[PDB]
Write a protein that binds this ligand. Sequence first.
Ligand code: SF4
Ligand code: SF3
Length: 543
Amino acid sequence: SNAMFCYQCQETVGNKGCTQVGVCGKKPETAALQDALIYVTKGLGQIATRLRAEGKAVDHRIDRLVTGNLFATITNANFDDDILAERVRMTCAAKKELAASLTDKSGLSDAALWEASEKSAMLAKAGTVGVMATTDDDVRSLRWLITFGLKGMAAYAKHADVLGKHENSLDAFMQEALAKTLDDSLSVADLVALTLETGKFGVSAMALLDAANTGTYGHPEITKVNIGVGSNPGILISGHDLRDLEMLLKQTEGTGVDVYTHSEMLPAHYYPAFKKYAHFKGNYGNAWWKQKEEFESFNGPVLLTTNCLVPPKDSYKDRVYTTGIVGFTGCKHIPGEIGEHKDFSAIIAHAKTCPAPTEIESGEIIGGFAHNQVLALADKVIDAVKSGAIKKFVVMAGCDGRAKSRSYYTDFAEGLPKDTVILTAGCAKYRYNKLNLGDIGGIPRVLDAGQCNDSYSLAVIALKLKEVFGLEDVNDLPIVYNIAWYEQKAVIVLLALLSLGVKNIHLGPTLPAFLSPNVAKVLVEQFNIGGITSPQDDLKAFF
Ligand code: SF4
Ligand code: SF3
């Protein structure tokens, strides 16, 4: 039989599924606990949805449990079985209490009713509630496409909540959609509808996080970021959470410890509020997947605010700190997932005992082209399109990863004619943001809008251009979409773009294993989704 089944990321074995051990390092009992956690979270969603329909209140603490549970099961987020098992217990306790306040308990699912306190009972239940519990290929495909989209949505909703923003309609949708994925009566048409609705609420979640980030730290602006290093001890902050960075910068003031960013923390440099801390140094290294080498050479402690964390080498494991929903057995954790005060005193003391970073490279990279900054430049962008100086934009946003085939994205970028502009967001950027690609009329040929969530800015920019040019269809803009994906935040970004009517998206380096033949056919027929081949062939064909 199979010890596990997981197919949620781009690197899944054979582009079919991980059945023994995850390519990411996820062990079968860890995979089982995540399957059990998702199951009881869907049960909680049903109960909460029923309470809302009865006219009864559901406290925001329930919303936070749901988003934390989903985020903990994203690829490279949490490998800690003790933490995962305790989240299962907490969820069982919470949903039992909520169900007791229902007037009518009729029609509650097994997920709503089932509970366990012993890990052994959780592992046994997991075996019959995983991916392959749904027998029909199309229903399975759509249920898990939706679930993965909801994980990405929940991540963005959680970062907004950390910064003090939440919307009842967003949390209500997430919980109702989760419940619908266990309802056997829904047709394929119902589930295709729910997939597109999930994309729409993906836009809403990204809009909420955009407002939270910019409202707190200012609108991103054009910024030069040092990729070399200084000579003081440092802490390297990775992942996505800007509130964790704020607290870390405040606590390192006056200490002699510098702060550097990694991977998806690069865009923190673009926000005006963070420029006021003199000990906020550069961005160190590249995307998440190089971290076994780059965390080693950094020498100082590393703080993971979100995914992606890879199972650490023994050489630096003792200086890895996790926080929020991130976890790895044997790595120190700083508690907190709601933006509350976190005590970084131990990581700061640790940093003072470590060597300064070993430099990988020197120079700079430019970014900060989020929606406010690009709309301020809109007249000049529009003039350049009208004159033919800019012939095409290419959206190359998304996720990077390990696959050797991803040299495609570097070669594609290098081979583009010098009258094109790359638009990016997310760690996919690292395949081409240290090339020397130049500028068109002073506009850089790579425009970095920020984190994967700042794909929102790219959509806002596209819709603005549609308006100014007076076009009926967003697809009539001179934009090619060549997006790379790895984890579930890329899935919500994709669904968001589809909900906005974007066609002709080229997705790679492979297509998700969780798209069944019939579901893929709908995406091809209605949205013209395609894949990649060689960079030289696609540089001809895509244009
Ligand atoms: S998260 Fe990806 S690599 Fe890890 S077990 Fe799942 S499909 Fe496999
Ligand atoms: Fe926020 S984009 Fe998706 S892969 Fe892991 S950090 Fe990267």
